[PDB]
Write a protein that binds this ligand. Structure first.
Ligand SMILES: CCn1c(-c2cccnc2[C@H](C)OC)c2c3cc(ccc31)-c1cc(O)cc(c1)C[C@H](NC(=O)[C@H](C1CCCC1)N1CC[C@]3(CCN(C(=O)[C@@H](C)N)C3)C1=O)C(=O)N1CCC[C@H](N1)C(=O)OCC(C)(C)C2
Ligand SMILES: Nc1nc2c(ncn2[C@@H]2O[C@H](COP(=O)(O)OP(=O)(O)NP(=O)(O)O)[C@@H](O)[C@H]2O)c(=O)[nH]1
Ligand SMILES: [Cl-]
Ligand SMILES: [Mg+2]
Lengths: 170, 166
């Protein structure tokens, strides 16, 4: 048999949500910035021996359309909360996403993974320990990724599936 | 108009002529922003809209264009420098044909702009309205049909020619 998971990629504009998604789906790094409105992708994978159909909703990094945002969060089962390690504001935004997801889904326990992207770049402004401490305070995984080198890309998405499965067990 | 300049775009679809859209630019109420668009339409500063693309067209909302620096929806520049401040919010996004500046947040006007195809009142106070379609709203409606929900166009919509009338 198989099981389907609705994954939603959220985070400030430019952090690499689409580049991460395109690496997962198409196995190449988009060097250019093509700003997202909204895109959906699907991919069948095996995670921990169990066949999964992944639905990936790649959202735009914007804060203007709250009715759409709320619906994204209602439908999504797990959230990849992405910041860029060279963008402190994007890291400071993270707690807002968690607060919104918990409110929309009426739960203190929503599957999510904190993703620190662009770890190939030499211009870091957010320390790994800062992000690890925030993730630990939420009880969620933290993964450093580079959509450019593909480091951590599969791990970020697969860990999110693992988090959804752990939540469904409760 | 006795006061406001009129500019035109000749729109192309995959290089083929679609038709002409003309705009009244509200220099009477939004002079700095109107003047930027006028001068980018004539090219008189040595750069401007001729050849650029309407890269994002979302039916029911707007046709957005004007990135002649990066040619990918991320760029553009004004006649005052890369960016200029939000001049005023006197005018609102009251319906189809409204011409308004695209931006990346407060005080980031460059050259990108959008033509509303519906009322977009949630943009009031966040984007500077500075003009309106005068003639050729049917051409804008034809352009809108090449758009899609995510903004990607099914054929490439460009400003084949542009300039000032009257
Ligand atoms: C929730 C679904 N979604 C719905 C929706 C809602 C309700 C129902 N249905 C939908 C859709 C039909 O469901 C699918 C709308 C919408 C709009 C965006 C994203 C998702 C949306 C959006 C995405 C963008 O990438 C940019 C913008 C909006 C604003 C846009 N700016 C830019 O393009 C500028 C350039 C212009 C000059 C400067 C560079 N850039 C490009 C790169 C960035 C992104 C953010 N950057 C930042 O630096 C941030 C961190 N400070 C850099 C940027 O700012 C702009 O001025 N305009 C003009 C007005 C219209 C607007 N575009 C647009 O397209 O509205 C589409 C629409 C449909 C009206 C709203
Ligand atoms: N060096 C490096 N660049 C990256 C990485 N991920 C994304 N980028 C670059 O950062 C820019 C923005 O990436 P993108 O994935 O489009 O960001 P987004 O979060 O989807 N933006 P939006 O919210 O507007 O849709 C692009 O130029 C892209 O190539 C990464 O891991 N390393
Ligand atoms: Cl917007
Ligand atoms: Mg994106």
């Amino acid at each position: 048999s198989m099981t389907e998971y609705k994954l939603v990629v959220v985070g400030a504009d430019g952090v690499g949500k689409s580049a991460l998604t395109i690496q997962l789906i198409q196995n190449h790094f988009v060097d250019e910035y093509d700003p997202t409105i909204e895109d959906s992708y699907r991919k069948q994978v095996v995670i921990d021996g169990e066949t999964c159909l992944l639905d990936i909703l790649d959202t735009a990094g914007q804060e203007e359309y709250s009715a759409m945002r709320d619906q994204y969060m209602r439908t999504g089962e797990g959230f990849l909360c992405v910041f860029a390690i060279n963008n402190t504001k994007s890291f400071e935004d993270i707690h807002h996403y968690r607060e919104q997801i918990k409110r929309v889904k009426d739960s203190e326990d929503v599957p999510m993974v904190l993703v620190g992207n662009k770890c190939d770049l030499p211009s870091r402004t957010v320390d790994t320990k800062q992000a690890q401490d925030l993730a630990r305070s939420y009880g969620i995984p933290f993964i450093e990724t580079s959509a450019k080198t593909r480091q951590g890309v599969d791990d970020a998405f697969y860990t999110l599936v693992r988090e959804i499965r752990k939540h469904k067990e409760k | 108009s006795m006061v406001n300049p009129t500019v035109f775009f000749d729109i192309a679809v995959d290089g083929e002529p679609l038709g002409r859209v003309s705009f009244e630019l509200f220099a009477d109420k939004v002079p700095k922003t109107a003047e930027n668009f006028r001068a980018l339409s004539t090219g008189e500063k040595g750069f401007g809209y001729k050849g650029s693309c309407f890269h994002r067209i979302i039916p029911g909302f707007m046709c957005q264009g004007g990135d002649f620096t990066r040619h990918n929806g991320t760029g553009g520049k004004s006649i005052y420098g890369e960016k200029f401040e939000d001049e005023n919010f006197i005018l609102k996004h009251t319906g189809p044909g409204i011409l308004s500046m695209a931006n990346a947040g407060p005080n980031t006007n460059g050259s990108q702009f959008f033509i509303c195809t519906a009322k977009t009142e949630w943009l009031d106070g966040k984007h500077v309205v500075f003009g309106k379609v005068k003639e050729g709203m049917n051409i804008v409606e034809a352009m809108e049909r090449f758009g899609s929900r995510n903004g990607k166009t099914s054929k490439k919509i460009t400003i084949a020619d542009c300039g000032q009338l009257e």
